[PDB]
Write a protein that binds this DNA or RNA. Structure first.
Ligand SMILES: Nc1nc2c(ncn2[C@@H]2O[C@H](COP(=O)(O)OP(=O)(O)O)[C@@H](O)[C@H]2O)c(=O)[nH]1
Ligand SMILES: [Mg+2]
Lengths: 239, 99, 51, 257, 234, 131
RNA sequence: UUUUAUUCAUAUAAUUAAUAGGAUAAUAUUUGUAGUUUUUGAUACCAUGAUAAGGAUUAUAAAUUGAAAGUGUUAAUAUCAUAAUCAAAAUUUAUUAUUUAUAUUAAAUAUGUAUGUGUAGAUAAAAUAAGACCCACCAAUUUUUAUAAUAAAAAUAACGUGCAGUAAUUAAUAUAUUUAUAAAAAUAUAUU
C-alpha cells in the first residue's frame, strides 16, 4: 500500500522528469546563511580576581555584582556596595591614568551622568557606613582622588567637603563612644478560678472532600464496651 | 567531562542473610547511643544488616510496611516505652525487640 | 576546542576559588581557637590565684 | 544482549528464606557445571559445532565466560566467543577499559557564595553572646522587642544579673552520681530506676546552701552516651566529676577530664 | 564509493568560471562566428527513403497519429444515428436537432468526447428513437440512403471534417460496411464504443537497435550489418 | 566442526533476525532506497511540511551557481531570441529538462542518483540564523 | 457376483627497493659522480568481474541471386579495487572425446601392456555443403480470581516435541464421539 516489498527497479517506462529553473534575483541576493562564523566565534577565559580584567570588563563585572547585591536587597549596612562602587570609579580612574582617551571633559553626556551617579552612590554609601566602619572615610578620600584624577572640580569639591565632614562626624561620634492585656486578664481570671476551686478533645479524620469526621466516645451503657473488656480466650487467658 | 554510566545487567545476588533493621528510641539521646552501639557492633561473616529507618517515635505503620513487606528477615528495635500507633500486624518473620 | 578549553578553565578557576574560601574559613577558625585558648589560660591562672 | 527476565519478576525473598534462584549458591544467571543436566551440555556443544566455534574443553573454566541470555524457554548459555553476545561483550569490554562515558551537567556557582548572596540572609539568627551587650540588643531586635533604631541605645541599657548556677554530675559507671543526686533531692530514684542504670539526662533545680537555686544535670556515665555527655558539658557552667574511692580512675573519667 | 558526476547543468557552472567564459563566448561572438501538418508528417516519413536515411517507425507512428487525431468517427456516428429519423415527425425533429447540436459541439471541441458519448447513448437508448428506428426498418421503402448522403453533405458544408471531401470517402466506407450486415442501421454497439472510449479518450477506428551492444556487455557478437554467408553480387 | 551439515535455513535466518540484520524500522531503508526523494517521515499533512516539500532548502553558494547558469544562458542568447521567448530578468527561464530510465537494485540505484545529483534527499544543510 | 559417441595421464620444494649521456660537438678527470642503520597486508588469501547452460520472430505474389544466428538469469569458478604468517621446480600421481592385423624406433630423453563373438547402465551432441507468513504442548519466569489440599485464565526473541492456515500441498467448515504423557487426527453426520 505504502511500502514496496520488491527492491529491484525494472527496465522499461520509469521515465523520471528533471526540471531546472533559475532566477537572477537568487544569484544577486544570495539571501543569508551566517549562523556561526570565525569572526563571531572566539575563545573564552575566566579569571577569579577582578584585577585581571581590563577596566571596561571590570566595570561589566561590577555592574553584575551590583545587580546581585540588589537581588540580595538587604540594604542596611552597605560597605560592600561602597567597595563595589569604589572599584567601579577606579575603572574610570585607571582608564584615564593608563592613557585612554576617556577624560571627564571629553566624556559625553551619558558617560558623564554615569560617572556622577556612580560617585554619588559611593559617597552616599560611605557616608551611611562611616560610623559603622572606621575606614569608610578612606573610600570617600579615594573617590575624591578619583574625581581629581578625572579633573572634575565640581564633584571634587563636594567630595572633599563631604569627606572632611564625615571625618569630623566620625571623630565626634567615637569621642561620644491589647492582645497582651487580654491574655493577662484571662490568665489572672483562670488562676483565681483555680484557687477558688482548690473539654476533652475528639479525634478528627478528614474522610472525603476534606470533610471532618469525629469519633465521639461510645456510650457507657451499651454492651460493646463490656465485650471489649471481657477476655478473648477464657481457657487460655486469666480471668 | 563524563560520568560513569551504570549497567543494569549486573544485579545483586544474595550471599548472606540480609537483615533489614529499623531502630526507634524513646528519646534522641537514646537513639544516638543505640546507633553508636549498633555501628560499634562488628559484622559477622554470613550476616549483613541494612539500617533503613531510625527515629525517636514508637512503632508506626510505615515501619511494619518497610520491614515486613520484603521477604528478607527483619528486626525492629524499640528502645524505651514509646507508645505505638501501628494499625497493621507485624509478620512472624520479623523480630520486634522491645527493650 | 573552544568549548572544551572554556569549560576546563572555568572549572579550574572555580575550584581554586572554593579552595581559597575554605582556607580563609580554616584560618578564621584557627584564629578564633587561638583567642579562646588565650582567654582560657588567663581564666585558669585567675582561677588558681582566686582559689 | 540484555540479562533480564522478559516476564515481570516479583519478590526474590520468601517470607523466611532467600529464593535459591537469587542466591549466590543457586544463581540462575550463573552456569553451574556441577548441577547442569546432560541435555544442557549437549545443546551447548551442538551449537558450538553447528556454527564455527571452538570446542568446549572444560566446563568449570567455561562457566567463567558463560554468558546468560534470558529466553521464554529459560536460560541460554552462550560462549564469550559466540556471535550472539557480540554487542554485549563489546559493551562490557568498553566499560572495563573506560567506564566513565556518560556526559554530566556543568556545576554551577558555588553554594557557599550563593549563601552570601541569598535574599534571606538577614533572617539568620545566632546564639546571644553572654558578654556582649551589642549582641544582646541585636538579638532583642531580631526577636522584635525593640526597633532597629534602638540597638545602640539599648546596648548601654543592657545589664547583667547573677543567674542560678548549672552543675553537671559526670563520672564513670556505678560511681554514685545517681546516688549523690538522690541524696541531694531526697527522691529515691536510684532504686526506682529501671535496670539500675541512667540513660536519660535529667535537670533538677534544688534550694541548697544559702537558699539559692542550683540546677543539677545527671549525666549518664555509660560509654555509649558520649553525645549526652557533650550536651551536659555544653549546657553546664560547673562540672562535678565523681570518682569511686574503691574503684580508681577509669577511661570514662579520663575522657570526661 | 561512487564518484560524483553531477549530470545537472546547474551543478557544474559557477560565477568564477562563467566570468571568463562569457568574454570569449557570448551572443555577439556566436553570431559573428556562425552563419498542412498531415502533409508535413508524410513528407518527413517518406524522406527516410533517401540514400542517407532509413525508414523509421517513429515517423510512421507520428503521421498515423496526425491522420487519426480527428473525431470524424464520432461525428459520423451521430449523423448515422440521425439518418434513420423521420423528417416529418416532431419528436424526430427534436432528436435530430439535439444530435446535430451534439455533433457540432464535438467538432468544435467545446464538449469532451466522454460526456458527448454519454449524451449519445442516453439519446439513442430512449424508447422514442427505438420506435422511430423500428418503423424506419419496417418500411418497405425507407430514407436511410438519402439521410446518410445528406449527412455527408452537411458534414462537408458545416466544416465538421478534417478535409472538405473526406466525408464522401467515409460514406463509401460506411456503405461497404453496411453490406456486411454487422449491425442494424441505427443500432450502434454502445458497449463496444464504451469499451473503446474508456481506454482511448478519442474514438478511433539483422535487427535495428538504438543502443548498440558493447564489447563488455556482449561477448561474441559482430553487428547487424555483417553477413557471415555472403553471395556474389553481379 | 569442519564437516558438519551446518545450521538449518530457518535457524540461521532466525539468528540473523535476533542479531538485528533486519532493521527495526523502515524509515532509514526507504529514505536511502532512492526511488523517491521525499524526506524521512514519508508523509506531509501539515502546511509547513508541505511548504518544505515544495521549496527544498538550498545553500547560497549553490543558489548563486544556479542563478549564474541562467545569467550565462541569457548572455549566450541574442536580443531577439530573448524578447520573443519572454526570457527577461524578471521572468524565470528553464535550464534543463530531460527524462531518464534507470534499472537495477534499489539501494545502488539510489546511491548512483545521489552521485549524479538526481536524488536531492539525505543532504546536509548548514544552519541559518534570523534573516 | 532422426542420427552420433563416451577406458582419457602428474598436482608444489624456501626469499624480489636508485638516477647517472663518449669519434667527426670551441675544451667540465663530472677519467673513475662513494652522507649505513624508524619500519612493517598477501614465500598462502584480492571478491569481485567474466564465463558456462541458454531460448525470441516478420519477410503476399511476382522479380532478384536474392532480402537474413540472438540474450536474461540461475549457477559454478576465479589470477582483479578491497581483511600479515606463507604452492610452482626435487614433479608418481591417478586430471572425458586414442593409432585393431601385406611391409612397423635416423638425430633435443620421447612409452611392455587391456587380443578375447565388439556384448551393460547412464551421459553428451546436431536439424548449419550437404543429401530425416505460520498452530498445540514442553520448557521458563510471572501475573491476576481464589487461601478451598482448590481451581482457572493470561502475558511472555533463541528449548524440546509433534506438523497447524495463508486458492498453501489437505473440498472447506461445524457439531458430536473416540486414542496417544495428552501433539496430531480418526470416526459419524449436518451445512455450503
Ligand atoms: N556504700 C556506698 N554505696 C554507694 C555509694 N554511692 C553509690 N553506692 C552504691 O551504688 C549503687 C547505685 O549506683 P548508681 O549511683 O546508680 O551508679 P551511677 O549512676 O553510675 O553513679 C547503690 O546500690 C549503692 O549501694 C556510697 O557513697 N557509699
Ligand atoms: Mg546513674
Amino acid at each position: 500500500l505504502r511500502f514496496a516489498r520488491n527492491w529491484w527497479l525494472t527496465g522499461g517506462n520509469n521515465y523520471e522528469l528533471v526540471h531546472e529553473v533559475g532566477h537572477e534575483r537568487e544569484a544577486t541576493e544570495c539571501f543569508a546563511e551566517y549562523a556561526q562564523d570565525s569572526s563571531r566565534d572566539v575563545y573564552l577565559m575566566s579569571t577569579n580576581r577582578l584585577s585581571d580584567l581590563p577596566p571596561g570588563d571590570r566595570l561589566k563585572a561590577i555592574v553584575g555584582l551590583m545587580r546581585s547585591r540588589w537581588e540580595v536587597k538587604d540594604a542596611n549596612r552597605g560597605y560592600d556596595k561602597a567597595k563595589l562602587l569604589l572599584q567601579a570609579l577606579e575603572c574610570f580612574s585607571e582608564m584615564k591614568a593608563s592613557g585612554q582617551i576617556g577624560d571627564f571633559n571629553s566624556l559625553p553626556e551619558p558617560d558623564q551622568d554615569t560617572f556622577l551617579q556612580y560617585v554619588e552612590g559611593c559617597s552616599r554609601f560611605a557616608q551611611a557606613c562611616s560610623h559603622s566602619h572606621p575606614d569608610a572615610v578612606r573610600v570617600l578620600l579615594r573617590a575624591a582622588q578619583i574625581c581629581e584624577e578625572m579633573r572634575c572640580v565640581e564633584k571634587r569639591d563636594e567630595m572633599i567637603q563631604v569627606t572632611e565632614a564625615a571625618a569630623n562626624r566620625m571623630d565626634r561620634a567615637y569621642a561620644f563612644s491589647n492582645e497582651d492585656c487580654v491574655r493577662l486578664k484571662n490568665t489572672e481570671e483562670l488562676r483565681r478560678r483555680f484557687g477558688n476551686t482548690a473539654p476533652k478533645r475528639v479525634d478528627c479524620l478528614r474522610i472525603h472532600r476534606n470533610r471532618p469526621l469525629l469519633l465521639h466516645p461510645m456510650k457507657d451503657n451499651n454492651k460493646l464496651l463490656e465485650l471489649s473488656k471481657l477476655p478473648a480466650r477464657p481457657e487460655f487467658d486469666s480471668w | 567531562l563524563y560520568a560513569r554510566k551504570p549497567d543494569n545487567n549486573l544485579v545483586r545476588t544474595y550471599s548472606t542473610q540480609a537483615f533489614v533493621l529499623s531502630c526507634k528510641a524513646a528519646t534522641f539521646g537514646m537513639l544516638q547511643a543505640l546507633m553508636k552501639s549498633i555501628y560499634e557492633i562488628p559484622r559477622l561473616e554470613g550476616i549483613s544488616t541494612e539500617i533503613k529507618v531510625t527515629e525517636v517515635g514508637g512503632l508506626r505503620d510505615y515501619d511494619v510496611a518497610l520491614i515486613g513487606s520484603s521477604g528478607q528477615p527483619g528486626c525492629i528495635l524499640l528502645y524505651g516505652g514509646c507508645k505505638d500507633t501501628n494499625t497493621l500486624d507485624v509478620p512472624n518473620h520479623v523480630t520486634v525487640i522491645r527493650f | 576546542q573552544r568549548s572544551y578549553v572554556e569549560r576546563v578553565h572555568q572549572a579550574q578557576v572555580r575550584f581554586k576559588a572554593a579552595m581559597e574560601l575554605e582556607g580563609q574559613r580554616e584560618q578564621l577558625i584557627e584564629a578564633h581557637q587561638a583567642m579562646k585558648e588565650e582567654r582560657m589560660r588567663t581564666e585558669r591562672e585567675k582561677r588558681r590565684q582566686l582559689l | 544482549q540484555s540479562q533480564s527476565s522478559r516476564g515481570q519478576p516479583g519478590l526474590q525473598w520468601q517470607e523466611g528464606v532467600v529464593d535459591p534462584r537469587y542466591s549466590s549458591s543457586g544463581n540462575m544467571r550463573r552456569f553451574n557445571p556441577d548441577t547442569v543436566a546432560h541435555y544442557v551440555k549437549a545443546t551447548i556443544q551442538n551449537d558450538r559445532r553447528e556454527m564455527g566455534l571452538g570446542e568446549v574443553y572444560d566446563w568449570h573454566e567455561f562457566a567463567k565466560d558463560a554468558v546468560y541470555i534470558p529466553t521464554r524457554s529459560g536460560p541460554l548459555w552462550v560462549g564469550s566467543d559466540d556471535p550472539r553476545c557480540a554487542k554485549f561483550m563489546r559493551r562490557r569490554s568498553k566499560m572495563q577499559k573506560t567506564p566513565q562515558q556518560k556526559a554530566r551537567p556543568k556545576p554551577g556557582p558555588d553554594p557557599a557564595k550563593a549563601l552570601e548572596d541569598h535574599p534571606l540572609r538577614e533572617y539568620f539568627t545566632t546564639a546571644t553572646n553572654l558578654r556582649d551587650p551589642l549582641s544582646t540588643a541585636n538579638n532583642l531586635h531580631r526577636a522584635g522587642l525593640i526597633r532597629e533604631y534602638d540597638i545602640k541605645y539599648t546596648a548601654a541599657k543592657v545589664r547583667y544579673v547573677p543567674r542560678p548556677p548549672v552543675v553537671s554530675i559526670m563520672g564513670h559507671v556505678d560511681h554514685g552520681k545517681t546516688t549523690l543526686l538522690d541524696y541531694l533531692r531526697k527522691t529515691n530514684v536510684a532504686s526506682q530506676e529501671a535496670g539500675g542504670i541512667t540513660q536519660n539526662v535529667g535537670a533538677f533545680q534544688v534550694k541548697t546552701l544559702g537558699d539559692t537555686l542550683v540546677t543539677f544535670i545527671d549525666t549518664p556515665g555509660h560509654a555509649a552516651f558520649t553525645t549526652m555527655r557533650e550536651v551536659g558539658a555544653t549546657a553546664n557552667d560547673l562540672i562535678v566529676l565523681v570518682v569511686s574511692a574503691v574503684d580508681g580512675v577509669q577511661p570514662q573519667t579520663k575522657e570526661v577530664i | 564509493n561512487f564518484p560524483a558526476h553531477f549530470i545537472k547543468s546547474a551543478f557544474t557552472t559557477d560565477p568564477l568560471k562563467e566570468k571568463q567564459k562569457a568574454r570569449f563566448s557570448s551572443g555577439g561572438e556566436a553570431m559573428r562566428e556562425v552563419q498542412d501538418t498531415e502533409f508535413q508528417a508524410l513528407v518527413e516519413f517518406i524522406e527516410g527513403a533517401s540514400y542517407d536515411q532509413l525508414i523509421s517507425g517513429r515517423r510512421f507512428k507520428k503521421v498515423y497519429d496526425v491522420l487519426s487525431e480527428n473525431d470524424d468517427m464520432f461525428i459520423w456516428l451521430c449523423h448515422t444515428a440521425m439518418s434513420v429519423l423521420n423528417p416529418g415527425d416532431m419528436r424526430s425533429r427534436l432528436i435530430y436537432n439535439h444530435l446535430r447540436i451534439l455533433a457540432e459541439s464535438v467538432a468544435s471541441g467545446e464538449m469532451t468526447q466522454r460526456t458527448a458519448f454519454r449524451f449519445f447513448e442516453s439519446a439513442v437508448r430512449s424508447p422514442a428513437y427505438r420506435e422511430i428506428a423500428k418503423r424506419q426498418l419496417e418500411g418497405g421503402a425507407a430514407t436511410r440512403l438519402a439521410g446518410i448522403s445528406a449527412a455527408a453533405d452537411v458534414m462537408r458544408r458545416m466544416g465538421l471534417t478534417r478535409r472538405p471531401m473526406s466525408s464522401y470517402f467515409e460514406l463509401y466506407q460506411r456503405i461497404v460496411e453496411r453490406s456486411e450486415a454487422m449491425t442494424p442501421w441505427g443500432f450502434p454497439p454502445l458497449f463496444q464504443f464504451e469499451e473503446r472510449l474508456s481506454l482511448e479518450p478519442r474514438l478511433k477506428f539483422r535487427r535495428i537497435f538504438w543502443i548498440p551492444p558493447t564489447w563488455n556487455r556482449a561477448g561474441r557478437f559482430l553487428g547487424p550489418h555483417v553477413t557471415l554467408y555472403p553471395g556474389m553480387t553481379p | 566442526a569442519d564437516r558438519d551439515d551446518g545450521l538449518s535455513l530457518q535457524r540461521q535466518r532466525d539468528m540473523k533476525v535476533m542479531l538485528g540484520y533486519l532493521p527495526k524500522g523502515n524509515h532509514e531503508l526507504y529514505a536511502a532506497r532512492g526511488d523517491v526523494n521525499v524526506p524521512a517521515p514519508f508523509r506531509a499533512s501539515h502546511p509547513t511540511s508541505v511548504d518544505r516539500w515544495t521549496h527544498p532548502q538550498e545553500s547560497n553558494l549553490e543558489q548563486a551557481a544556479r542563478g549564474s547558469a541562467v545569467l550565462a544562458k541569457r548572455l549566450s542568447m541574442t536580443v531577439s531570441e530573448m524578447h520573443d521567448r519572454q526570457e527577461t530578468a524578471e521572468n524565470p527561464a528553464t535550464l534543463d529538462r530531460f527524462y531518464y530510465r534507470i534499472q537495477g537494485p534499489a539501494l545502488e540505484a539510489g546511491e548512483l542518483k545521489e552521485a549524479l545529483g538526481l536524488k536531492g534527499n539525505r543532504k546536509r544543510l548548514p544552519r541559518r540564523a534570523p534573516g
